Symmetry: C2
């Protein structure tokens, strides 16, 4: 469960990195979806 | 208004950099399992992005 949660946190961090990358292209819809997914995941 | 449009490019651009910075801060916060901070940062990032 500890390692599991740590992986969930890794996934949130990865999504945030993906969003940062998308924004280098001003790819707003991609970054919106990735941030939304990171937030939904962090909530649950 | 070349200058005024450049101001806009710089401002919307400043907003995008702030969104990226908030995401970076959230990544760092999560290294400390600091969920409330990361949640606030991602929320602010998403709100700023929706304003563009």
């Amino acid at each position: 469960k500890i390692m599991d949660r740590a992986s969930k946190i890794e996934q949130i961090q990865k999504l945030a990195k993906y969003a940062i990358s998308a924004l280098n292209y001003e790819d707003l819809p991609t970054a919106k979806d990735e941030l939304t997914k990171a937030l939904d995941l962090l909530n649950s």
